[PDB]
């Protein structure tokens, strides 16, 4: 981003060794047996003794911070995404459901799409001009690098690890987006010769041509290849681009500013599961029989516009976190609401280039293999969307409690009520106050959270006593949060020590092969908060076979929740988890209301 800004920002720190190990042991107590804790406790003491293993690894990290702009950046990008071989669909790329639009006919659908494209191009203006406003997370300026990674970029399949291409700052920045309709991709320029952006009306006229140039779904859904295992896609990709035409088409897709998906009508479903289906549409496409083939999941930004009014998006995670994405959404959405003005006549426009794909028996086979893979993925996904209308940040705030901590504590209560024990819990923490900062881990399962969940369901504990435990759990969570955004958490630090050991060519410390670390890094609950002015909601699949993926947008009067699970694990159920979460939130409000503070 703006160089002047990025330079004034502090570099990612390396927390003290003893400090992090201290927090580690604390966060483990509620999720591991006493026997395992005692053992882990021993490993830690040795690991940090003077002239020991840990001390040496720690020095390595500090040297790393001196030789790099961010000691964690590259390591995190590779281990979290580039080296993650599972399909990006569901397992990595978050999906987003935006507010349903009122268009009723195809003309309105395209009308909205054109407005959306224009809105994005407007946001891009600030990016190219480095005029994008400065953000804060608590009186501290935040890194804006992520904003210069989302547009005109794409992920690229690699035989061993993937890579990412960014053409935003290339010699001749791309001036075209890509539009997908009935599995067919089209290259569309959204800028004039002079360099001015096309207007909503102009873009509309073009979208009309595009739609009529692909009225039927008779072409192979080549885009579905992008939803397969990364290793498999890497080989299919390499073969796919052997053809000049194919290579040319893929190239346009990768360089395009962003992709717009014009989804077709899908089989009407029961109103009680409608939202869950739309969520599926945005996350994976619904299947090879619906809209999954009308996408290119390597593309950083994909905006989806259904024909029934539904709209949303799915983005490739290597590029950024939710905040930057929603900032873009809030701007675009608010832009689509801007009234009209001088609808002067516009001169003829060129015909959008159709990105053809020469299919061969080998490619066809890859496509079919991709369809089968995706079917298995989809069928195994259990999604439940929950709109918590009872209240939002309003209640927790009136109680002088952090809404996010209130929600996280509520989730811990719900989980305990179901399984009778706590579990490793992950919550995304933004480290953007640091140059190139991405995230760290806030662990919601703690000593105080466990003390609360137990006392809460205890029919022998005074209701007033449960209130104290509640506030203490929330405060303990707020504290952890404050430390996390300040680079004082320990998860990324511990990962760094492990990676430092590998690089130092020294044996893997037992502390990392310890059963406790395995449990600690096996997140049965993987979560994140993605606040937005737009009444939208995000979602993603669980990070472990027996876990849940929960995301939420805390609004003032309500909270948009998404809960995912895998059907392969009989012990988990999205609907049930959502129900217990709704009830945990209500029960906590009831407890606090029953015992007011003032007088
Ligand atoms: C962890 C994190 C979500 C906490 O954010 P937060 O804004 O501090 O959340 P809180 O619930 O504490 O605060 C929300 C609101 O309640 C208020 N509040 C907090 N504590 C309060 C209290 N004790 N009493 C009254 N109000 C309080 C805040 O001022 C804020 O006010 P607002 O509604 O006017 O903005 C944030 O630090 C973060 O890391 N966000 C990014 C997460 C991310 O990366 N997500 C995407 C991952 S892909
Ligand atoms: C979805 N989840 C929590 C697994 C990953 C976050 O989106 C990103 C992060 O916390 O690094």
Swiss-Prot record:
Database matches in SUPFAM superfamilies: CoA-dependent acyltransferases
Enzymatic reactions: (R)-carnitine + acetyl-CoA = O-acetyl-(R)-carnitine + CoA; propanoyl-CoA + (R)-carnitine = O-propanoyl-(R)-carnitine + CoA; butanoyl-CoA + (R)-carnitine = O-butanoyl-(R)-carnitine + CoA; hexanoyl-CoA + (R)-carnitine = O-hexanoyl-(R)-carnitine + CoA
Domain of life according to the entry: Eukaryota
Residues spanned by motif Microbody targeting signal: 598-599
Annotated catalytic residues: 317
GO biological process: carnitine metabolic process, CoA-linked; fatty acid beta-oxidation using acyl-CoA oxidase; medium-chain fatty acid metabolic process; short-chain fatty acid metabolic process
Cellular component, GO annotation: endoplasmic reticulum; mitochondrial inner membrane; mitochondrion; peroxisome
Described purpose of this protein according to its UniProt entry: Catalyzes the reversible transfer of acyl groups from carnitine to coenzyme A (CoA) and regulates the acyl-CoA/CoA ratio. Also plays a crucial role in the transport of fatty acids for beta-oxidation. Responsible for the synthesis of short- and branched-chain acylcarnitines. Active towards some branched-chain amino acid oxidation pathway (BCAAO) intermediates. Trans-2-enoyl-CoAs and 2-methylacyl-CoAs are poor substrates.
Stated family: Belongs to the carnitine/choline acetyltransferase family.
Listed name of the protein: Carnitine O-acetyltransferase
Species per Swiss-Prot/TrEMBL record: Mus musculus
Gene from which this protein is expressed: Crat
